[PDB]
Design a protein around this ligand. Structure first.
Ligand SMILES: [Zn+2]
Ligand SMILES: [Zn+2]
Ligand SMILES: [Zn+2]
Ligand SMILES: [Zn+2]
Lengths: 249, 249, 249, 249
């Protein structure tokens, strides 16, 4: 290649083809969250905006294990939380409070196509400290000047997020957004990892922050949406290899 | 759905049908504990009250790996510890001291149908600090005002537990109770996770407690028995998918 | 049962039958160490005294992954380190320095039939602190008054161990001994776990030691060789289920 | 055996045979990194010098998951970064900045045949502290006087590395080099582990360094290139058993 083609979604011939791709991609993302162990109980939601109606969203149904997510399980929800399509008999239900956090962000930011939230271990533990993410590794520079902190309702979270790619919700955990499902997933994986790294390092000693000019330089390379798409790609390759036959149903 | 149906056990046509469901559910719970790595050596017991005789209990047999538990292995024990049914030739034996902790609680609290105890890593490590669980995450609010601490015999533990869903046993580990096997399991999973979270955060820095009104609000949503049932449900879905064919024997 | 039969090895009809049992049991133990992740590089040795000649020992061959150990791979070594039987062409070799640590202990203590050593993560990290194991959990009471600490050659280790079940070797890791392979394995699993627990708890706060009378009481229940045999049993059950077909070859 | 034969690569009849061996070995190494969880996003590169042209290198193609690496995926790159052979249609691309770090080292040190770099969790976290690796375990003595620290461009890293086997790159992670792929891999595995160990121990208390004469003694045994080859060998045995059929394609 041909790197450019690898940093963007494939071309879609029809809106129906795009919808089919996006639903499978959302399921793959949910399966990645289970494979990484990012899920806890029934908390967590991953949404993608429908490609035909911008006020409709595909989401995981409430209570179904991320590890068992399939395309047939996804439900369609309108902006106000009404379940209007998809799913299986017996679980055409959405976690409303959780969904309306996403809905508020999708409404505020038209370019945001996907949002990820889960009560992952390290993000949760780090969020209990009410500290900003320290920019102490090359990988963390994806978040330089681009991660919010709420010292904590849907409106309040959307306002706090502004135009940033991610937010640390105090005493709660992590939420990320993307122009693609893929980039939102990359940002969640990377943020959970850097929270893990900070908990390890801060317990052991005193970190040295990356000098800000170097952090800015690295952000140009790692922090934009095409870079996010590419940085997520090996996780999607692997989950398709491991569980694609299962989750495509 | 139909969320209400998902937060309660299925209806049982006969007492025999209920017993068959409960034995399989107890085995699934034991298999979840092994899959989560909550077990250590031969410590640990999970009990469920028999649906016909309130003074009889199904329990794992002493020394059998949780990872290999099957319905045929479970033994029936009366209130005073006599093995009176079930099991396989050669292992119709109960860990008595451990069982009588459960027996004392079941006797004191008729609504408690299931009790979980295991020497899980993070609960054990946290219990060695003799500190109450800090309410620092949304998930931890399931335990707001509802987790005991014993600064440590069966009677003493039952008295310390009072009407709460869980107890941290100093220098020992965790024990949880439920009106269902499912809720007892949810509380154990959630408590082990929050102990892990507190060990991570306390090593790294100073946590910020959730403001008490917010904790109380979240407890109303996460802390009751139907919520416990629902919060456990993905773990039972997954373990059935992974190992159901094995453990149903 | 029938608990007594579960706390001792089976009866052996002939010395040949005993040797076959012990070789398979040693392989199972080595496979458990790999499954627990206790191994690192090519470090580590597990030995069992031959049942016919007390000056001969079965041991893993140098450089073979614990994960791939089979009965056919084990080699027979005399007291002075000469490889005198067993193994496969191309790897009839023993790690001599490591083996002679075991040899010195086997010589000093005729009742010691099995010895385990591996550079496991938590034992290694804890050993770098040059501190005695704190008795802060019920499980740790298996080591109450019965674990040595060397502030560190084979003779020096044997002298430091005295009649105890285990030793923490400063800047090195853990070594355990048993009257059976099973009990030596239980002590290693339990000691590695308690080192993990102490590292977690000490990083987070101040532990509270178990009161010594309570520790002594619990040691009577957990610390003797029959209890060790029983406490190891679920690990052997599981590894046989997972990998027995492989490792029996 | 026959230990000497186990500490060196097999003899190669032709340059073509050597190239085939080395490509498979590089893929096995990449698969080990995935199996150990050393990879993160699309970061990381492992290179081996071509056996016919010393200015040509085999490397993983940019963006392909380490877990899915196969011999057919590897690409051939010249000293200046031009992709000149190998790979599959659509991913004949190299991460240039990352590769030129390797290129600078390969140019400076003709004996270095293989270089490993990945953004592994513990190396990354430890590198954020800007501290030298403490020599506190027997395993760590492989790095006694032989690991660099850059208080951080390709030239700067090569200069900082000097003739040492490994370097801790501040705020970045780990890089190792070897006269063989195998030894470079051993050094990476061992360095990542010792970073993990130091983070654990430093959080818990005060480590005791190994006395320098003892560290020097142990380095003679663990720190040379033949020892590295042997110390890596169980990881290659295991990954071939688990995934060889996949990655040989
Ligand atoms: Zn949430
Ligand atoms: Zn207990
Ligand atoms: Zn050793
Ligand atoms: Zn890098």
């Amino acid at each position: 290649g041909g790197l450019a083609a690898l940093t963007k979604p494939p071309t879609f011939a029809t809106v129906e083809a795009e919808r089919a791709w996006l639903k499978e991609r959302l399921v793959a993302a949910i399966r990645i969250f289970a494979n990484e162990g990012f899920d806890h109980t029934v908390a967590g939601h991953l949404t993608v905006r429908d490609p035909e109606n911008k006020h409709h969203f595909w989401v995981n149904p409430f209570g179904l294990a991320f590890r068992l997510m399939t395309v047939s399980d996804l439900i369609l929800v309108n902006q106000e939380g009404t379940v209007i399509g998809g799913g299986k008999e017996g679980r055409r239900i959405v976690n409303l409070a959780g969904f309306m956090i996403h809905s508020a962000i999708h409404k505020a930011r038209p370019e945001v196509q996907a949002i990820c939230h889960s009560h992952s271990t390290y993000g949760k533990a780090f969020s209990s400290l009410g500290k900003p993410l320290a920019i102490t590794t090359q990988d963390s520079c994806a978040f330089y000047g681009d991660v919010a902190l709420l010292g904590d309702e849907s409106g309040t979270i959307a306002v706090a997020l502004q135009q940033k790619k991610a937010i640390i919700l105090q005493n709660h955990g992590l939420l990320t957004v993307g122009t693609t499902i893929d980039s939102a997933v990359a940002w969640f994986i990377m943020l959970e990892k850097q929270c893990q790294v900070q908990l390890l390092a801060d317990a052991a000693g005193q970190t040295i922050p990356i000098d800000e000019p170097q952090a800015a330089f690295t952000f140009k390379e790692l922090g934009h949406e095409q870079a996010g798409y590419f940085q997520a790609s090996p996780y999607f390759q692997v989950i398709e290899h491991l569980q694609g036959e299962e989750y495509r149903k």
